[PDB]
Assembly symmetry: C3
Homo-oligomer: 232 residues x 3
C-alpha cells in the first residue's frame, strides 16, 4: 500500500537486512560532451569530432525539499561520417565525425541524495516511467585561416525510454549507486548539413554541438523498486 509520490516503504525486516520499497519522482537533467580535435598544418583540417561521457551536477525541488542529483550521459552505436574537401593543405577536411541515429543508444545514469540510492545494489520489481525529449544540434563553425567558414548545422533525435538497469557513476570521489536509463532514438527534423559543401539532408545528431547552447536536457519521470539494504 502506497500513500505518496516520494516514499520509503518497509517490505521486510531482519536484524541486519531489510527490503525497502522506494518510490521516487525524478527530474533527469543531463548533457552530452564532445571531443573536437584539429589536425596539424595550416588549420583547414579537423581529425575528429566525437561524443564523450558528460557529467552534470544539479539541484531541484521535490516535496518542498532540495534534491541534489548527479547524472552521467554516454552514447553507443555512433555512426562515422567524414568530409573530404581534397588533399591540399588548404582543402577543408573533417577526417571523422560521429552521428547518433536510430541504430544508436544514449544512456543517462542518475543518482540523487535521497534514501532510495543508499546502498542500491540488489533491486527487484524495478519499474520506471519517463518522458521523451528532443535533442537538436547547434551550429558549429569551422574557422578556416582564409576564406569563408564552413558551418555544420542542424540535426535532431528524440529520446524514448527503453529499459533501466543498475549502474555506478564513478566520480572523482564517491562512487554513486545509480539507475541507468537507456533511450532508443528516432531521427527528427531538421536534417543536418555543412554550409559551403555538397553535404546536406542527413538525419541524426552530430557530435559537433549536440547541446545547442542549452545547459542541460531534461526528462521527467518516476521509478518504483524494492531494494535489499543493510538495516543499520
Amino acid at each position: 500500500m502506497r500513500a505518496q509520490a516520494n516514499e520509503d516503504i518497509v517490505v521486510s525486516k531482519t536484524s541486519l537486512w531489510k527490503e525497502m520499497q522506494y518510490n521516487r519522482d525524478i527530474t533527469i537533467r543531463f548533457k552530452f560532451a564532445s571531443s573536437i580535435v584539429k589536425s596539424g598544418g595550416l588549420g583547414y583540417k579537423w581529425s575528429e569530432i566525437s561524443f564523450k561521457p558528460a557529467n552534470y551536477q544539479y539541484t531541484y525541488t521535490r516535496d518542498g525539499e532540495e534534491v541534489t542529483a548527479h547524472t552521467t550521459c554516454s552514447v553507443n552505436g555512433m555512426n562515422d561520417f567524414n568530409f573530404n574537401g581534397g588533399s591540399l593543405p588548404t582543402d577543408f577536411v573533417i577526417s571523422r565525425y560521429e552521428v547518433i541515429k536510430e541504430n544508436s543508444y544514449v544512456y543517462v545514469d542518475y543518482w540523487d541524495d535521497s534514501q532510495a540510492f543508499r546502498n542500491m545494489v540488489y533491486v527487484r520489481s524495478l519499474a520506471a516511467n519517463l518522458n521523451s525529449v528532443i535533442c537538436t544540434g547547434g551550429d558549429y563553425s569551422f574557422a578556416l585561416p582564409v576564406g569563408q567558414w564552413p558551418v555544420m548545422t542542424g540535426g535532431a533525435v528524440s529520446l524514448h525510454s527503453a529499459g533501466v538497469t543498475l549502474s555506478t557513476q564513478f566520480t572523482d570521489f564517491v562512487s554513486l549507486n545509480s539507475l541507468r536509463f537507456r533511450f532508443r532514438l528516432t531521427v527528427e527534423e531538421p536534417s543536418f548539413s555543412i554550409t559551403r559543401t555538397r553535404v546536406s539532408r542527413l538525419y541524426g545528431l552530430p557530435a559537433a554541438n549536440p547541446n545547442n547552447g542549452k545547459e542541460y536536457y531534461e526528462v521527467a519521470g518516476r521509478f518504483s523498486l524494492i531494494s535489499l539494504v543493510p538495516s543499520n
Copy 2:
C-alpha cells in the same frame, strides 16, 4: 552432494539470504582487438599497433538449452617492438607494435545468463578447470603508396589457465557480474616476421592481427563455487 554437470544446490538459507553451490560447464569464446594508427606524411609510416579490450557476445547449447554469454578480453605486460626501415619520408616504418610473450598475461572475463552469475558478489570455494588454447597471428599488409607491400606474418602463443577472480564487465548498458580468468603464455610456432625486411624468427603474438581471421578463440572448462545471494 553433487548430481550433474550444471546445477544449483542450496547450501544454507535464511528468509533474505542464501548460500548457493553453483556448478557449471562453460564454453569461453573471446577475441582480441587492435589499435593501428598511421603517422603523417606520405603514408609509409605507422605510429602504433597495440592491443585493446574486446567484447564478444554469443550463444551456445548447454544441456539442451540456449546459453547467452559475453566475454571481455584484455592483456597486460605486452612488449614493445619496432621497425625502422629508413629516415626518408618515403621509408617503411613501425614506431611501436605490441607483442605478448611469456612475460605477458591475457585475461578473459566471462558471464552467461544462467542463475550462477546473478548477484555473484560474495564467492567461497571458487574452483575452475580450463583447457588451454593456441592463438596465432594472421597476416597484416602495410599498404605503401608505392612498391610492393610488407606483410607482418606468423606469431603464436598458447594460453594456460592461471587463476580466477571475480570481476565486472562494464557494458554500455548492464554491468555484468563475471569471473575473470587469467592466462599465462608460452610462445609457440610459427615465429613472426615482416616480409620485405630482415625481421624474422621472432616469438610471440603481435597486435597487428591476433585473431587470424577467426571470429573467436575457444576454451572449454568448468567451475564450482559457493555464492552468497539474495533469497528473493
Copy 3:
C-alpha cells in the same frame, strides 16, 4: 556494547548465521606517488604539447604489530589548473601548450588497500573515521632540453595535503579488483613558488605536473582508521 582493546583489532559488533558486523581498527601507513604524461610537439624539438597528471599505483609492505603488511595504493587528482608557455610560433620558439598545476581548488585522492581482514569484503561501511598526518609535496626540476640555447627548467612548487573525507572505492588492477578506502586530500599551496628558468614565468604557486615526486620513491601519510563493516559470516 563493544569496547576497544588495542590499535589493530577486529571486534564483533553483531553476528548472525550468514552476516556479521565487524569493527575494524587499524594503524595505516599510506604510501603513494604521482605520475605524469609528458608529450613533445612533433616537428623538430622545441615544443611540448602536454604535461599532465595521470593516476599512479604503488605496491609496498610495512610492519604493523610485528607482522608484515602488504598494501596497494592508487593516486589520482582532480580540479587541476591549466597553464601554458608560448615563447613564439616559429619552429625554434620554446613552447609547452598545456601543463597542469594542482592548487587549493584541486583534490588529490589516494585509494588504499592492504591484505588484512579489514579490507576483505568491505562493501557496507559505517562509523568510518580516520586520523592522518599531513604531507608536503614539492616539485623537482624538469629541464626542457632543446636544440640550442641555454635550457629552460621548470623548478619549484609545493602544496600540503590535508585529509578531507573518506569513502569506499575499488582499485581495478589488471586481475583482482581491490575493495578500498579512498582518502580525499584538500590542498594548501606552500612555499616555494614555481618558475621556469630562462623565461618570464615565476612566483606561481602550486605543484606542476612536471616532476611532482621530486625524486622521492613515495610520499607517505600515516594515521589510523576505525570503521564498522557488514560482512559475510563464512
